[PDB]
From a paper:
The second crystal form of [name] [name] was obtained by using a lipid detergent mixture, dimyristoyl phosphatidylcholine (DMPC)/3-[(3-cholamidopropyl) dimethylammonio]-2-hydroxy-1-propanesulfonate (CHAPSO), which has a tendency to form bicelles or bilayers. These crystals belonged to the orthorhombic space group P212121 and diffracted to 1.7 Å. A comparison of this structure obtained in a lipid environment with the [name] [name] in a detergent environment shows major differences only in the loop regions, which are reflected in their temperature factors. The displacement of His254 due to [name] substitution is much more pronounced in the structure determined in a detergent environment than in the structure determined in a lipid environment. The crystals of [name] [name] obtained by mixing with lipids are type I membrane protein crystals, as described by Michel, which mimic a lipid bilayer. A total of 14 fully or partially ordered lipid molecules have been modelled in the current structure, and with contributions from symmetry-related lipid molecules, they form an annulus around the protein. The presence of connected density for two acyl chains in three of the modelled lipids unambiguously distinguishes them from detergent. Most lipid molecules are clustered around TM1, L1, and TM3 in both leaflets. A well-ordered lipid molecule, PC502, fits nicely into the groove created by helices TM2 and TM5. Second, the bilayer thickness around [name] varies across the protein, and lipid molecules adapt to match the local environment of the protein.
Author numbering: 93 to 245, 248 to 272
Write the structure that this text describes.
């Protein structure tokens, strides 16, 4: 795994520990999507919501998926590709989530949906890229998708589909250019 892959993991782990020590609220005051007009130009907040997780299962599986999928993108396609997928999917998934239920949300789930769509489709359309989602892992991706869809580890399905759409779109275009 490359530097973007690892720095994200470090960030999420430190933030999660901080949320346990300080409480979710205090950390959200710093990192959440802007929740007051006076914060609308704190432009990092359109992305930093992605760094907060709300349970052990939430962060554990997100970081496993991020490490595998994000790591593959970074290794084969470069840090830049990973950064763009991450920023765009975080921004769009965050935007959709906040429109539906307000600014108090967080985590990498939307980004992971984008990376799943990206790695799966790029691998299927463009095997030469060296990127692919192994069939064994497709099994677990579907389990993880269905479980989250029914809120077993709420009400964020639309935002997640928005993330998936970003990944599928980028993979499609990238496979044409490649
Ligand atoms: C070195 C260069 C660094 C540049 C870093 C800053 C770039 C981002 C600036 C902050 C973005 C705020 C967007 C916003 O919060 O704008 C919404 C505002 C209220 O409505 O006005 C709007 O909607 C306007 C239309 C939607 C946008
Ligand atoms: C606060 C929470 C923090 C959690 C963060 C976890 C995020 C993922 C960490 C993975 C780091 C692996 C990097 C590495 O250093 O690699 C390890 C090893 C290398 O081996 P190598 O030297 O041959 O290369 O191989 C492997 O990564 C094996 C990878 C497969 C791991 C599967 C774990 C499944 C756990 C299921 C739990 C379900 C509970 C219900
Ligand atoms: C909570 C419900 C949702 C569960 C979601 C689970 C998500 C797990 C994602 C892990 C991603 C990182 C894994 C990774 O990046 O690793 C890469 C490497 C692949 O192996 P390889 O390419 O060398 O070939 C294998 C040799 N072969 C082809 C002959 C078999 O190692 C591996 O993938 C090791 C495989 C990891 C399997 C872990 C399964 C844990 C499921 C527990 C929960 C079940 C619910 C009840
Ligand atoms: C948006 C979601 C990502 C866009 C790609 C969707 C997945 C995909 O891979 O779409 C494939 C299809 C392009 O066809 P092709 O290059 O596989 O075959 C070309 C025909 N030939 C084989 C005889 C040369 O793209 C299309 O549908 C292009 C239109 C997409 C509109 C989606 C509306 C919902």
């Amino acid at each position: 795994a490359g530097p973007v892959t690892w720095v994200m993991m470090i960030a999420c782990v430190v933030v999660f520990i901080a949320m346990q020590i300080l409480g979710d609220q205090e950390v959200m005051l710093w990192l959440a999507w802007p929740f007051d007009p006076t914060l609308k130009f704190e432009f990092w907040r359109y992305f930093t919501h992605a760094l907060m997780h709300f349970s052990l299962m939430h962060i554990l599986f997100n970081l496993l998926w991020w490490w595998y999928l994000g790591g593959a993108v970074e290794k084969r396609l470069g840090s830049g590709k990973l950064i763009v997928i991450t920023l765009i999917s975080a921004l769009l998934s965050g935007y959709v989530q906040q429109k539906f239920s307000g600014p108090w949300f967080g985590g990498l789930t939307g980004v992971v949906y984008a990376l799943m769509g990206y790695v799966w489709l790029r691998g299927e359309r463009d095997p030469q890229s060296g990127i692919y989602l192994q069939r064994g892992l497709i099994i677990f991706a579907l389990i993880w998708i269905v479980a989250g869809w029914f809120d077993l580890f709420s009400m964020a399905n639309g935002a997640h589909i928005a993330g998936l759409a970003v990944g599928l779109a980028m993979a499609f275009v990238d496979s044409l250019n490649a």
